[PDB]
Design an enzyme around this catalytic site. Structure first.
Site, short mmCIF file in Angstrom:
data_model
loop_
_atom_site.label_atom_id
_atom_site.label_comp_id
_atom_site.label_asym_id
_atom_site.label_seq_id
_atom_site.Cartn_x
_atom_site.Cartn_y
_atom_site.Cartn_z
N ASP A 1 0.84 -1.15 -0.17
CA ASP A 1 0.04 0.11 0.03
C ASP A 1 0.91 1.23 -0.06
O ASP A 1 0.59 2.30 0.77
CB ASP A 1 -1.07 -0.05 1.21
CG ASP A 1 -2.19 1.17 1.07
OD1 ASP A 1 -2.24 1.67 -0.04
OD2 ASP A 1 -2.81 1.23 2.09
N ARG B 1 -0.19 9.26 1.10
CA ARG B 1 -1.13 9.53 2.42
C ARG B 1 -0.57 8.33 3.34
O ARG B 1 -0.94 8.50 4.75
CB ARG B 1 -2.65 8.82 1.69
CG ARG B 1 -2.68 7.41 1.47
CD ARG B 1 -4.25 7.07 1.16
NE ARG B 1 -4.08 5.45 0.61
CZ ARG B 1 -4.00 5.56 -0.86
NH1 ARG B 1 -3.77 6.43 -1.58
NH2 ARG B 1 -3.77 4.12 -1.46
N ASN B 2 0.10 7.32 3.10
CA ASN B 2 0.92 6.37 4.26
C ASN B 2 2.43 6.84 4.48
O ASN B 2 2.94 6.10 5.13
CB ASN B 2 0.70 4.96 3.71
CG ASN B 2 -0.33 4.20 3.92
OD1 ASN B 2 -1.03 4.54 4.61
ND2 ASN B 2 -0.91 3.36 3.07
N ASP C 1 2.36 2.60 7.39
CA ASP C 1 0.99 2.15 6.74
C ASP C 1 0.03 2.20 7.98
O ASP C 1 0.09 1.54 8.88
CB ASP C 1 1.27 0.49 6.25
CG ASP C 1 -0.03 -0.08 5.58
OD1 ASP C 1 -0.90 0.70 5.44
OD2 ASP C 1 0.06 -1.10 4.79
C1 LIG Z 1 1.79 -2.82 14.52
C2 LIG Z 1 0.91 -2.69 13.39
O1 LIG Z 1 0.98 -1.30 12.75
C3 LIG Z 1 1.63 -0.85 11.81
C4 LIG Z 1 2.40 -1.86 11.02
C5 LIG Z 1 3.32 -1.70 10.21
N1 LIG Z 1 3.61 -0.36 9.68
C6 LIG Z 1 4.56 -0.13 8.64
C7 LIG Z 1 4.34 -0.68 7.43
C8 LIG Z 1 5.15 -0.62 6.50
C9 LIG Z 1 6.50 0.12 6.79
F1 LIG Z 1 7.19 0.31 5.72
C10 LIG Z 1 6.70 0.79 8.07
C11 LIG Z 1 5.78 0.70 9.06
C12 LIG Z 1 2.96 0.59 10.30
O2 LIG Z 1 3.18 1.83 9.89
C13 LIG Z 1 1.85 0.28 11.38
C14 LIG Z 1 1.28 1.46 12.00
O3 LIG Z 1 0.24 1.33 12.99
N2 LIG Z 1 1.50 2.83 11.73
C15 LIG Z 1 0.78 4.06 11.82
C16 LIG Z 1 1.27 5.08 11.21
C17 LIG Z 1 0.98 6.44 11.44
C18 LIG Z 1 0.00 6.76 12.44
O4 LIG Z 1 -0.30 7.78 12.86
C19 LIG Z 1 0.44 8.64 13.38
C20 LIG Z 1 1.71 8.50 14.01
C21 LIG Z 1 2.39 9.63 14.31
N3 LIG Z 1 2.28 10.83 14.27
C22 LIG Z 1 0.95 11.01 13.78
N4 LIG Z 1 1.01 12.43 13.66
C23 LIG Z 1 0.15 10.24 13.10
CL1 LIG Z 1 -1.19 10.83 12.60
C24 LIG Z 1 -0.31 5.57 13.36
F2 LIG Z 1 -1.20 5.79 14.24
C25 LIG Z 1 0.10 4.47 13.03
#
Ligand SMILES: CCOc1ccn(-c2ccc(F)cc2)c(=O)c1C(=O)Nc1ccc(Oc2ccnc(N)c2Cl)c(F)c1
Length: 271
Positions: free
Chosen positions: A131, A135-136, A149
């Site tokens: 994905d 946006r990610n 993600d």
């Molecule tokens: C444990 C399961 O979760 C995963 C698992 C894998 N990966 C992953 C997948 C592929 C990659 F290459 C690297 C990581 C993820 O990124 C996440 C995740 O939860 N990401 C997540 C992201 C943003 C978020 O929001 C935020 C956070 C900080 N600051 C602000 N302002 C905001 Cl808005 C948030 F809350 C959660």
């Protein structure tokens, strides 16, 4: 699994969730304070999940260490909570769409180079993103891009872009998907390369939606006819050639992430 997850698990007594400080259906994101036993208190973002696969995702993310990949502070089990370092400027798409921001043409190419570096790191570890999109990607206080993600946390907000498979339950971002993935539902490092090509187009248009005049159902036929996204007005000719190579119908003809880092570094620093 219990012994394997030990270094990722956070005790409930160690985390302070600021429930009245919402950042942003499948979960809410709040401001938080993590109490570290061997250092200073950490400002974080806490995501709630409204189970066995979830902890394995935690072990994979905890092993990531690269300036262009989002790291995991840990997981709190009691609904489960995901603890992340706080990212001051939110997601990359919303940042470049902001009319009060003035990124230069070089700054936009620079964000693209940062993503390519993070993806080169992930592909070397055999991790398939599935994905990849603006946006990610997150942006910290030093304007460092972090590949991440949101999972299912923004599927309702981004309902215009996501399809959910009726059999597999898989999240399908149609307008970012490679031709072979739209036909087989199979994802590779080469289909991540196609998505990166779409991400570059987003950056050079400052967050315009891709194929706005094409129906969801007509995307496969549009691509089989050999048609692609048009060259953005302020995208350099050598950077558009890179985009076209990312969208080659044969997965094996697409460049590696190492070749992408090399060509984009040249475009970024040369006149
Ligand atoms: C444990 C399961 O979760 C995963 C698992 C894998 N990966 C992953 C997948 C592929 C990659 F290459 C690297 C990581 C993820 O990124 C996440 C995740 O939860 N990401 C997540 C992201 C943003 C978020 O929001 C935020 C956070 C900080 N600051 C602000 N302002 C905001 Cl808005 C948030 F809350 C959660």
């Amino acid at each position: 699994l219990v012994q394997a997850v030990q270094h990722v698990v956070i005790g409930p007594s160690s985390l302070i969730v600021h429930f009245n400080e919402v950042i942003g259906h499948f979960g809410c994101v709040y401001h938080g304070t993590l109490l570290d036993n061997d250092g200073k208190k950490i400002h974080c973002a806490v995501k709630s999940l409204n189970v066995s696969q979830f902890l394995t995702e935690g072990i994979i993310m905890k092993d990531f260490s690269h300036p262009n990949v989002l790291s995991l502070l840990g997981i709190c089990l009691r609904s489960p909570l995901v603890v992340l370092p706080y990212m001051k400027h939110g997601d990359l798409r919303n940042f470049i769409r902001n009319e009060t921001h003035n990124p230069t043409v070089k700054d936009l190419i620079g964000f693209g180079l940062q993503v390519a570096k993070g993806m080169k790191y992930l592909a070397s570890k055999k991790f398939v993103h599935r994905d990849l999109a603006a946006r990610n990607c997150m942006l910290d206080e030093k304007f460092t891009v972090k590949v991440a993600d949101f999972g299912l946390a923004r599927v309702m907000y981004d309902k215009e872009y996501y399809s959910v498979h009726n059999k597999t339950g898989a999240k399908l971002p149609v307008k970012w998907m490679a031709l072979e993935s739209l036909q087989t539902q199979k994802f590779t490092t080469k289909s991540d390369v196609w998505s990166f090509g779409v991400l570059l187009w987003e950056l050079m248009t400052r967050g315009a939606p891709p194929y706005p005049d094409v129906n969801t159902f007509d995307i496969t036929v549009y691509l089989l006819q050999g048609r692609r996204l048009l060259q953005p007005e302020y995208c350099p000719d050598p950077l558009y050639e890179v985009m076209l190579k990312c969208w080659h119908p044969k997965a094996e003809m697409r460049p590696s992430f190492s070749e992408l880092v090399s060509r984009i570094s040249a475009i970024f620093s040369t006149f």
